[PDB]
Structure 1
Amino acid sequence: AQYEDGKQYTTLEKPVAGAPQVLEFFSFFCPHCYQFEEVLHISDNVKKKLPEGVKMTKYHVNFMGGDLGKDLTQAWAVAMALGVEDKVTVPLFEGVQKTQTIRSASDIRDVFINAGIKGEEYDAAWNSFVVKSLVAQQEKAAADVQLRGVPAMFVNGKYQLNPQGMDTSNMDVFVQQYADTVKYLSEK
């Protein structure tokens, strides 16, 4: 077959009931995740190949970066609760990996302040029980699939994308193969 288990995707041995339709895991410490955001725009390109209104979910993970990795999962919960993901994704990636100016929870907060989120608004979300629950949701979703690596995509709780089985001589072709595989899996 053109799409084969083990080539473009793998199949979870223990599928996850009630998982999001399209679920991405990433870390701001993750070098491939940086590339998936700024160089390849994987999420944008996957979204353009799926029907309108399809739910794409993106969660941060704890297992990269120690204390700061957990702070970043909480900050992503804040970004999700406030709806400011598109405002902070690039400054957070570049603060961690390009300029290396993010070293503390206060440095993360500065990114949100510079992006126009009010200090009281950020701090109130950071300490909120809604954010505590969003943190739990992200942890539970990664636990459900026993996640050991990022960037990762899962489709319908059953299929995991396999980007290493994909051609990387051309960045544009790679993105297209990845996006077309998600479409195929979403229709499976």
Structure 2
Amino acid sequence: AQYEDGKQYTTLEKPVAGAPQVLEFFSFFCPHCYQFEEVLHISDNVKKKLPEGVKMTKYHVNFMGGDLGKDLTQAWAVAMALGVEDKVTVPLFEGVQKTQTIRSASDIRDVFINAGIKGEEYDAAWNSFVVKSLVAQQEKAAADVQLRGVPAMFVNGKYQLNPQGMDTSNMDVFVQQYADTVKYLSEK
């Protein structure tokens, strides 16, 4: 077949019931995640090709960057709660990996302030139990799928994208191949 298990995707031995239809994991410490966001715009391009009725979920993981990794997962929860994902994703990536000006919770916070979220608004969300369960979800979802590396995408809790098995000669071709694969898996 033109799409094969073990080629453009793999199948989970233990499928995950009731999972988000398209589920992506990343870490702001993850170098390929940086590329996936900044250069490739994977998430956005997958979206452009998905059916209608399709929800995209994106979650942060703890297992990179120790204490600041965890801080980053709580902060991403805040971002989701407040609907400001598209205002902080880039400065967080560049703050961790490009400029290296994120070294503590307080620096993570500065990214939000500078992106226009209010001090009070941020600190309340950060401390809210809505945010705690959102952090819990992020952890649950990763734990559910035996996640030990990022970037990672899962379709209907049953298929895992395998970007290693696609041509990287040409970046645009890579994305389109990736996205068409998500759509195939979607329909499957």
The TM tier, using the shorter chain, reads over 0.9
Structure 1 CA distance for aligned equivalents of residues 38 and 91 of structure 2: 11
Within 2, Cα distance between the matches of 1:17 and 1:84? 29
Number of corresponding residues: 188
Q: Distance in 2 between matches of 1:115 and 1:54?
A: 29
Q: What is the CA–CA distance in structure 2 between the aligned matches of 1:121 and 1:3, rounded to whole Å?
A: 47
For residues 168 and 155 of structure 1, the distance between their equivalents in structure 2, rounded to whole angstroms, comes to 22
State the distance in 2 between where 1:139 and 1:146 align: 11
Q: Please give the TM-score of this superposition, normalised by the length of structure 2.
A: 0.99
Q: How much has 1:52 moved relative to structure 2?
A: 3.2
Q: Secondary structure at the match of 2:122?
A: helix
Deviations 1:5-26 (A, max 9, x none): 0000000000000000000000
- Offset of residue 51 of structure 1: 1.7
Deviations 1:130-187 (A, max 9, x none): 0000000000000000100000000000000000000000000000000000000000
Q: What is the distance in 1 between the residues matched to 2:68 and 2:53?
A: 33
Q: Distance in 1 between matches of 2:53 and 2:70?
A: 30
Corresponding residue for residue 68 of structure 1: 68
C-alpha separation in 2, matches of 1:53 and 1:165: 28
Query: What CA deviation, in whole Å up to 9, does each residue of 1:83-112 have, x standing for no partner?
Result: 000000000000000000000000000000
Runs of 4+ residues over 3 Å off in structure 1: none
Any idea what the Cα deviations from partners look like across 1:50-70, whole Å, max 9, x if unmatched? 023410000000000000000
2:154 alignment partner, SS class: strand
* Map of 1:157 onto structure 2: 157
Tell me the distance in 1 between the aligned counterparts of 2:91 and 2:61: 18
Aligned CA RMSD, in angstroms, stands at: 0.5
Corresponding residue for residue 182 of structure 2: 182
SS of aligned partner of 2:131: helix
Distance 1:138 1:18 in 2: 15
- TM-score computed with the length of structure 1 as normaliser: 0.99
Partners of 2:68 and 2:172 in 1: CA distance: 33
Secondary structure of the 2:107 match is helix
Task: Name the structure 1 match of 2:125.
Answer: 125
> Separation in 2 of the partners of 1:16 and 1:52?
22
Structure 2 residue runs without a partner (length 5+): none
Q: C-alpha separation between the residues in 2 aligned to 1:167 and 1:139?
A: 32
Identity %: 100
CA distance in 1, matches of 2:186, 2:27: 24
Counterpart in the other structure of 1:143: 143
**Which deviates further from its counterpart, 47-56 or 35-44?**
47-56
Return 72-81 or 43-52, whichever deviates more.
43-52
The residue matched to 1:23 in structure 2 has which SS?
strand
Give the aligned partner of residue 35 of structure 2. Answer: 35
